[PDB]
Each structure stands twice: as C-alpha cells, then as structure tokens.
Design a binder for these strands. Structure first.
Length: 127
RNA sequence: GGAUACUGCGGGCCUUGGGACCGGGAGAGGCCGGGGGUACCCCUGGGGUAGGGGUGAAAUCCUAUAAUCCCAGGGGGACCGCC
C-alpha cells in the first residue's frame, strides 16, 4: 500500500542538496547534489541542476517504493544567511512532475534566539 | 554737624523658592540568588556513498582512517531573536 517519505532540501547560494528519507529520517533512500550532475563549480546552484538532481532522486525513490513525500526546505542559517537559494522551488516542481505525490511543505531553517558572532569583522566584506 | 531710600550688622515675622513627609501608580535605574530558551562547536552510536566547501573565476582546506547530509544521545562556553 501507500508509502510516505521526506525530502530534505538544503539550498545555498553555492549548491543544492536533495535527500530523501523515510518518515523518521533515520534510514536513507536517495541522496543527490548539484555537483553530481555538472562539471563546473559556478553552476552547481543552477535551477537546472536542481531539477536534474531532484528528478534522479525521485526516480530512485519510486523504484525503492516510495509514493509520496513531505518536504522540508532549509537554508544554511544560524550565523549565516536565512534566505534560501534559487534551486529550492525548481527542485520541488521537478519532484512533483517526476511522479511523486506531495504533502506538507515546511521551512525548517534554524533561527538564533540569540546567536554566536558572524565572520565579517565589524566592517564586512569590502570587495 | 545732619539724613536714612539702597547695601551691611543686629532682633522679630511670612510663605511663594528649596528641603522633609503621606498616598495610589510608571519605568531595559543598580546588586544578589535561582530557573530557562533557541542557535553554534566537539564526542559516541546508526544510515548512506562520492564529493563538500568557497569565489567575480579559482586554489589552499576537509574527505574513501567514510566527509558534506539525515537520525538518536552526551558534554561544553558565550548570547538573550520577533514583540
């Protein structure tokens, strides 16, 4: 009968990771990244790479037997940026297209209720 | 020798300036003690396997002595988001 899983999507300005797991997240099924499907490093955060990686992950997941996924999208966060990258929505769309069904879509970025210092230096990057 | 408005000295009064006291309230004023919140780093188990990271583009660096990623736990030091 039906089978449910979870897609963790890690989205930064330099790459994207799609990782499909069981409900509990303790057993892993398919894990793909952006640098797995391109040669150049300046194109890993491509929405196209997001699409490809999500498609392959979803195909292998379905082969394993999963039918639906919940989605947890996640920017790096903490002391780093809270804004996700471009590949997140691309990956969600390509996942739904490739066949899997979709449940809840939640954003699980970590937020500082207050936090350790970030890496600038009181003036920031000065190009 | 005379005068007594103003200033000064001395002696009595006043309450407007100032100080004291009472009453219901406001406030991230200060010190001491207790209890907490996320986030971050390390360690130990489990899963999984080829890259991660970073840039304007790269390289050093970490990684097949199993990294990045997901899960269960244990320990630590700083800080108190939105309102």
């Amino acid at each position: 009968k039906e089978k449910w899983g979870v897609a963790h999507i890690y989205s930064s300005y330099n790459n994207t990771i799609i990782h499909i797991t069981d409900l509990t997240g303790a057993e892993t099924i398919s894990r793909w990244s952006g640098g797995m499907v391109v040669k150049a490093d300046r194109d890993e955060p491509s929405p196209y790479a997001a699409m490809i990686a999500a498609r392959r992950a979803a195909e292998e997941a379905m082969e394993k037997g999963i039918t639906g996924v919940h989605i947890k999208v996640r920017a790096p966060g903490g002391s780093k940026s809270k804004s996700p990258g471009p590949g997140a929505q691309a990956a969600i769309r390509a996942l739904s297209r490739a066949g899997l069904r979709i449940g809840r879509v939640e954003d699980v970025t970590p937020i500082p209720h207050d936090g350790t210092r970030p890496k600038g230096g009181r003036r920031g990057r000065r190009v």
